[PDB]
Design a protein around this ligand. Structure first.
Ligand SMILES: Cn1cc(-c2ccccc2)nc1COc1nc(N2CCOCC2)c2cc(Cl)ccc2n1
Ligand SMILES: [Mg+2]
Ligand SMILES: [Zn+2]
Length: 313
């Protein structure tokens, strides 16, 4: 009970900042997650024995892909940690518990392929789940791990608290389907400007939690340039592999996934920052002002990609 986790001084300070990089020492990531659960939630939220067993089961069910891997999981949970800590009083005991777990689990058993690739391949998961295919899988995998003997980190919640948290986690993981983000931010944008946004409205919280999930999921764009730059290589390594597989099915992939069109990456990063990332952190900042440094970092990186096009690097 009195057994805290503690981090070296530099990590203890930097972990509290949005732009924190969890670093290349795999073996420290579980301890970093527990540390975040303890400060964000309390040392009582979960039985340590059970949390540690759940953490390592989740780790095992992430695969060795260039980007959608265990390191992505922990990175995306740290971003949620930073948002929750800079917005102390806006979230319930249950939401702080649920959202960190949701973020750790949100890409469980990812194979590095899009929902589109699964449908064109005619993958069995595409039959089971016609929309948000991988995301429904990720929730499925999350439930499965929660039902392993000794893995129920929520066992001390009442019957209805338990159902609320699994529902928070389900909506949270579904929301990471970027196809659903555009309409979610549009609605949040309209509600904020007409002044109808009400955080006591459960359907409104759902939407705000959803946008937080998109913000955490894309957090690689909110790091220092060298982190953002080197992650982009891992993102494209999956995309070009997926394009390779599209060609094997006799389909020309979209340019994004065509390794023949590497040259156009800087332009494609601009489209993405402008079409997705900037809108996302802007609406997030409007709703939760203390999340501004994510917008500020994203804009710096937008500017870094602009400099690459102009052959300044
Ligand atoms: C849109 N577009 C078009 C092109 C392109 C490139 C070359 C030729 C023609 C076109 N390059 C992009 C960028 O896509 C892209 N997608 C991301 N998501 C989407 C879903 O999977 C998770 C990651 C992403 C996530 C993060 Cl964190 C950071 C950067 C990202 N960049
Ligand atoms: Mg995903
Ligand atoms: Zn993800």
């Amino acid at each position: 009970g009195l057994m805290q986790f503690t981090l070296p001084v530099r990590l203890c300070k930097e972990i509290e900042l949005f732009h924190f990089d969890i670093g290349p020492f795999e073996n420290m990531w579980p301890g970093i997650f527990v540390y975040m659960v303890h400060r964000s939630c309390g040392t009582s939220c979960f039985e340590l024995e059970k949390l540690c067993r759940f953490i390592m089961s989740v780790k095992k069910n992430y695969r060795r892909v260039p980007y959608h891997n265990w390191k992505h999981a922990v990175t995306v949970a740290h971003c949620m940690y930073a948002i929750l800590q800079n917005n102390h009083t806006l979230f319930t005991d249950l939401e702080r518990k649920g959202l960190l777990i949701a973020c750790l689990c949100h890409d469980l058993d990812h194979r590095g392929f899009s929902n589109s690739y699964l449908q064109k391949f005619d993958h069995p998961l595409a039959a089971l789940y016609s929309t948000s295919t991988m995301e429904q899988h990720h929730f499925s995998q999350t439930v499965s791990i929660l039902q392993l003997e000794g893995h129920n980190i929520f066992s001390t919640l009442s019957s209805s608290e338990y159902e609320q948290v699994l529902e928070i986690i389900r909506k949270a993981i579904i929301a990471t389907d970027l196809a659903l983000y555009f309409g979610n931010r549009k609605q949040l944008e309209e509600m904020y400007q007409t002044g109808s946004l009400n955080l006591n409205n459960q359907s409104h919280r759902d939407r705000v939690i959803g946008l937080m999930m998109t913000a955490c999921d894309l957090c690689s764009v909110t790091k220092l340039w060298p982190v953002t730059k080197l992650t982009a290589n891992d993102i494209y390594a999956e995309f070009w592999a997926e394009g390779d597989e599209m060609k094997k099915l006799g389909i020309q992939p979209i340019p994004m996934m065509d390794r023949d069109k590497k040259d156009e990456v800087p332009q494609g990063q601009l489209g993405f920052y402008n079409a997705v990332a900037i809108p996302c952190y802007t609406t997030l900042t409007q709703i939760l002002p203390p999340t501004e440094p994510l917008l500020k970092a994203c804009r710096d990186n937008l500017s870094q990609w602009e400099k690459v096009i102009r052959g300044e690097e």
